[PDB]
Write a protein that binds this ligand. Structure first.
Ligand SMILES: Nc1nc2c(ncn2[C@@H]2O[C@@H]3COP(=O)(O)O[C@@H]4[C@H](O)[C@@H](COP(=O)(O)O[C@H]3[C@H]2O)O[C@H]4n2cnc3c(N)ncnc32)c(=O)[nH]1
Ligand SMILES: Nc1nc2c(ncn2[C@@H]2O[C@@H]3COP(=O)(O)O[C@@H]4[C@H](O)[C@@H](COP(=O)(O)O[C@H]3[C@H]2O)O[C@H]4n2cnc3c(N)ncnc32)c(=O)[nH]1
Ligand SMILES: Nc1nc2c(ncn2[C@@H]2O[C@@H]3COP(=O)(O)O[C@@H]4[C@H](O)[C@@H](COP(=O)(O)O[C@H]3[C@H]2O)O[C@H]4n2cnc3c(N)ncnc32)c(=O)[nH]1
Ligand SMILES: Nc1nc2c(ncn2[C@@H]2O[C@@H]3COP(=O)(O)O[C@@H]4[C@H](O)[C@@H](COP(=O)(O)O[C@H]3[C@H]2O)O[C@H]4n2cnc3c(N)ncnc32)c(=O)[nH]1
Ligand SMILES: [Zn+2]
Ligand SMILES: [Zn+2]
Ligand SMILES: [Zn+2]
Ligand SMILES: [Zn+2]
Lengths: 369, 361, 369, 357
């Protein structure tokens, strides 16, 4: 009941020589520098019914060389699973094993889609941890055929100080987007080239994400990704159709012009007029506002095209600034800003919810020429 | 034209780093072995340099191809390609490597939070969370965090009490922030289960948020910390909006059971009741984590509607599973904050709903 | 040639059940939660001369139960050392083995010194990485019997923006020290009690470390540690005698009063009068200014004692602010600030080298009342 | 009065305490060390830390310390000891996990010239690292300086060198790990021209966990003698005068003063040397630290002496050139003008690098 050499070689091959339970590279010893095959081929169901996970109904003979029953493991993970059969049951190991092999198979069968710079931009203005994993962006990239020369750029804004999101805070945000990011992109010019693709995901203040989009909007190969509460960086549903984007035009008059975006949620009119008395409200919405609505990149593009029409319509109404009140997903805030890089050179005054002022909207950044 | 010769050590390295697929068409070159036939490594694949011959083993630059793809590649007399494939080849190896290291993306912090009541009658040992974590690839590397909500002081569960609960949980959560590792230095995931009164669980959600790699687990009366049925579809979440009027706005969540309307109006005279329910309310309804996500999505769609109706507080009367209470609290951690007044039944006052927690302005 | 159970028990004991080469806990499986002894007792010199590191002059019988030859290793580390004898030679393993055992013995014989909050404060104002390892502070704490309930507080200032250390930069520094730090200490109020000991090390802007010192100067049980270019967080020499702190009193006059601290290096008088024309210079120095001079905490105490006298004497000369020009180690910058909380309530205007003005001194923070 | 334990409980408690009394620190394996049988149950007592099970709350005490503890009839303590017990276990744990503080990045930096005559392989740095407890987790970084363009090694060239080195390291320093999430240590060896090595030092600094290694003609990347004391460093102060201030470093060899005044007429020469200048003098890392300490003591004097640049003429080993560069990375910056020998222009010194404002 000994696994033969051919089967052991298949196990090493189908796992790419990494431990299926911890991911460590079993083909090399990085401490001393020698190539060495230090993994072990491990049986889920043992040959003896008295072994760990042993069961009589298992016919050892029939599965000695069955790779569905054989994992590549490091010595430590192998020792643990054999010392704790109840804690590493057959069904759980089999499920992890099949999931591991399937990730390899999908990687091997994905067409090459070129290089991109991974870019994560995140704030600290929430009262919870806010952290996008680098691995998840790289995995979403790979699923689309994109790879990177390095793990990329990850910018975390300084947290608000004791006065909240004050002038200092927004200066820091400006410096992070317009100076820190630019410096880190310059350091990648030699490895990625003059005009590289940018695989960008943000989870940060809405005004900050708009400023980010304005800063990078003139990059022709920007590839927007999205953090999703359920799916993390995985697109929820590549087949989903974008929603209708409904628009209500502003009333006539000379009051300040407000653009209200009700996409993540319905922005209450009372909160807009409280912050901007006399506002003339134009609203872009979807039928069922929802935090979950960024189902794929086509949704993002459909938002962009809907917005492009309405920004033209509003800029034709007035030379004065447009005041923005947005409950929108983070990926849509980036795309909003990218429309302002060149296509829409009007002044936009971005309002945002203010925890220091009982959730009222207050004016934050000015965007535009 | 020519063929590139390699020794056997080089073939084994190349087969391993490519996982035995052709790098140009993706075909799995172990097909013979899968059919029960001998694996003829040297006949079902060709190994060639990714780049044309330069002016000057180097296994990192050798490609694994199927015979068909190899024959389609123009080659010089030494078996080098006439056109560069290094970009495609390096990208192939990077995609394999990223998949192969994916298990270290499961580095995780276990967190169990219970009330004193449930710690006394229904203690959840770390072993129960750890084995459920391990089954879905979440791997703890240090002792799990097991804490109880603090007993209230003389002022009861006032604003300061709840802020102290949040501070205490978030202090423990500094492990999630700081104990970075794996291939990329990512912060570890949080694996969290709660069993406590619904207001306390909402404050646990307030503490953890929903903008990090975080997996909620659920204690189930029959299945403990294992998910009852990973294939179960989430139920429909039904909603009835409130009647129009000036009375206080109440949101009733009838998910574990049907909350009787009279208990709500008794506790909140004049209440205008909106209700979120499922077709068959049940203590057992958290069949998998997708049920929790689906609850969140439906809830937020309706909270958007309710919050727009009035500036005044939403008064919450919830019969919901513990994991759903955590997600409810986590949902309300945006910058935007509407006022929510959470009621909970007092067993020592005839099970009457009493206001227990305020969220927002 | 079979190591007996008594000796295996001693090996497990003297290593505290961790892998001597990677430090992993071999008494417990953290993934599934079962106590398990999954380590291996490993021989440096093998019983057979044909084994890894084997040699003919090794009397295996004589060393079967010789704990100098027996390491506790995890299965992975043990596999590697047996697969690459040239990369893990006998003398190198023996040295690592003995060093590991001595660290355990020293920890076990250290008298208890109570609990303390670990605090690391570091800037990003250098043109190189600046990063104090958490482990090294905890290890210096443990060498003095101090332990903590968590790995502690680590505050990293925001980097200077594109304008250098501007008003925004110093506002961020103030917020990091006066708000961020206080919030982090507040979260620990219950765990550590009311007036806990504070084990603090800084490597940050001199004016910022002085402000840090002022913020913690009224604390009881403040325990300053020091980052040293040779010894990291270890005190260089506990037996070293503190240097004499030489003092040159200021000239009589009506010009602005400057305190020059020449401890790390000699501050050139020319640079002080350039920044503050007509300065009346008082100077505190040591006989041989040196970056390495913080040999132990008694040196910091001696600096405090000297400053007590000299600040009193300068403060009696004028009601006007005192202008500070300091080339001093980071630990002494904290100590200087700590004297301003209650001992010396006078206005101090801190100058610092300005990389945006050709290394000239420019005024930065104002400290004191 | 006595709490009783079986063998398995003893195994656990002895292991988590490393076999010392938690109250006085005495090593309770003394008998075994003397060659006598280990009498676990007689050289120590185990009792709960708290008045009143879980092996985590059982303490190991020597008989004397156990005798001084008031106990109830079941052997539980009357007074709580859990704080001292938990602190003791923490100190043991911190020591036992110290090997994971060795996570490290290998870095080999060479010039094309020295790569041709003396290529340093990663394997050699890794084995020296491993012997010191430094543990790489991925491929080592092996780089060489770019060739200059037509403007030579000017300000822009050296700034691009620094930027490329720091970028290369950034990727690895993000790979935090171990028990506390610390960034890995840098293990660096350089073999290139002295100016390039100083710029390597400028890139890495000296305010992080970083260990320099040294290539030695006899011992390669292994330290010649870990026990060797560092040499004394002999200082010649510069004469008074108006000429340009020169610092001559005669560490590898004695630099002839005439070669300096030829390159820099009128030079006021300060010198730092050792009693026996030698290519072999980097006997251990403490020699490098001692060089930095002596150097900075004198640089403090020289920088205070004049606002003008310090002109550097250095016969120093490669590892010391790196540390020279790293020393000059404070906010404070004095101008240094670095000279180097042009072996094909009759070994004449020529200015090749400026550090400072
Ligand atoms: N419900 C609601 N929200 C309103 C209202 N008026 C303004 N808002 C703001 O809209 C955003 C809605 O949340 P989101 O998750 O759809 O999008 C945010 C936003 O793009 C960015 C910053 O967050 P924040 O400042 O909280 O803005 C929130 C709200 O204040 O990041 C996105 N984001 C936040 N958390 C997450 C997360 N967990 N996952 C993914 N994206 C997130 C109003 O009336 N009602
Ligand atoms: N039947 C019914 N229940 C109502 C009504 N109005 C309010 N409720 C409350 O809803 C919860 C329903 O029980 P659950 O098991 O689905 O969820 C609880 C809850 O999230 C948390 C605290 O429990 P409790 O304070 O009893 O709230 C219970 C009920 O009073 O923990 C969950 N929980 C409690 N025990 C368990 C358990 N053994 N296993 C798993 N989860 C548990 C109303 O009108 N009717
Ligand atoms: N040589 C010299 N230095 C001068 C002069 N005028 C002002 N200075 C400043 O004094 C400090 C001397 O360096 P240090 O290492 O002794 O102390 C620093 C200081 O306490 C803090 C911030 O650094 P910085 O802003 O560079 O101040 C440096 C200098 O500008 O951190 C300490 N620090 C910096 N680097 C390290 C390190 N690697 N290890 C330990 N502590 C460090 C003047 O005329 N001459
Ligand atoms: N004898 C002598 N040398 C002088 C004088 N003035 C300047 N120098 C330069 O000092 C260096 C001394 O050699 P080293 O081996 O001690 O250090 C070199 C140096 O750090 C780096 C580059 O070499 P180079 O440009 O030749 O500088 C040489 C000399 O010109 O690398 C070090 N290095 C070079 N080769 C090796 C090697 N094989 N092993 C180890 N380190 C090496 C003067 O008057 N006299
Ligand atoms: Zn493993
Ligand atoms: Zn093919
Ligand atoms: Zn190990
Ligand atoms: Zn004792």
């Amino acid at each position: 009941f000994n696994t033969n050499d051919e089967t052991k070689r298949i196990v090493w091959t189908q796992t790419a020589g990494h431990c299926e339970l911890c991911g460590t590279d079993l083909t090399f010893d990085y401490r001393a520098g020698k190539p060495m095959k230090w993994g072990e081929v491990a049986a889920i169901l043992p040959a003896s019914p008295k072994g760990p996970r042993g069961r009589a109904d298992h016919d050892a003979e029939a599965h000695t060389n069955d790779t569905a029953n054989l994992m590549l493991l490091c010595p430590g993970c192998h020792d643990k699973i054999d010392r704790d059969a109840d804690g590493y049951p057959e069904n759980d190991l089999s499920g992890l094993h099949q999931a591991y092999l399937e990730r390899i198979r999908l990687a091997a069968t994905t067409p090459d889609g070129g290089r991109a710079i991974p870019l994560i931009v995140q704030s600290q203005h929430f009262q919870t941890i806010n952290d996008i994993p680098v691995r998840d962006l790289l995995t979403a990239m790979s699923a689309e055929g994109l790879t990177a020369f390095d793990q990329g750029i990850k910018i975390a804004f300084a947290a608000p100080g004791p006065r909240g999101r004050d002038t200092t805070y927004w200066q820091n945000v400006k410096d992070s987007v317009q100076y820190e990011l630019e410096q880190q992109l310059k350091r990648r010019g030699g490895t990625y080239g003059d005009s590289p693709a940018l695989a960008v995901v943000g989870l940060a203040d809405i005004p900050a994400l708009m400023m980010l989009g304005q800063s990078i909007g003139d990059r022709s190969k920007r590839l927007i990704f999205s953090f999703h509460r359920e799916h993390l960086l995985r697109w929820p549903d590549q087949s989903a159709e974008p929603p209708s984007f409904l628009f209500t035009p502003p009333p006539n008059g000379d009051g300040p012009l407000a653009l209200v975006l009700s996409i993540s949620a319905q922005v209450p009119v009372r909160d807009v007029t409280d912050a901007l008395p006399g506002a003339r409200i134009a609203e872009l919405s979807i039928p069922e506002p929802s935090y979950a609505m960024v189902q794929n990149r086509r949704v993002i593009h459909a938002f962009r095209d809907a917005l492009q029409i309405r920004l033209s319509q509003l800029e034709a109404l007035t030379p004065d600034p447009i005041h923005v009140f947005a409950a929108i997903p983070a990926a849509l805030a980036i795309e909003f800003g990218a429309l302002l890089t060149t296509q829409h050179q009007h002044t936009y005054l971005i309002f945002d919810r203010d925890k220091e002022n009982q959730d009222r909207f207050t004016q934050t950044l000015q965007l535009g020429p």
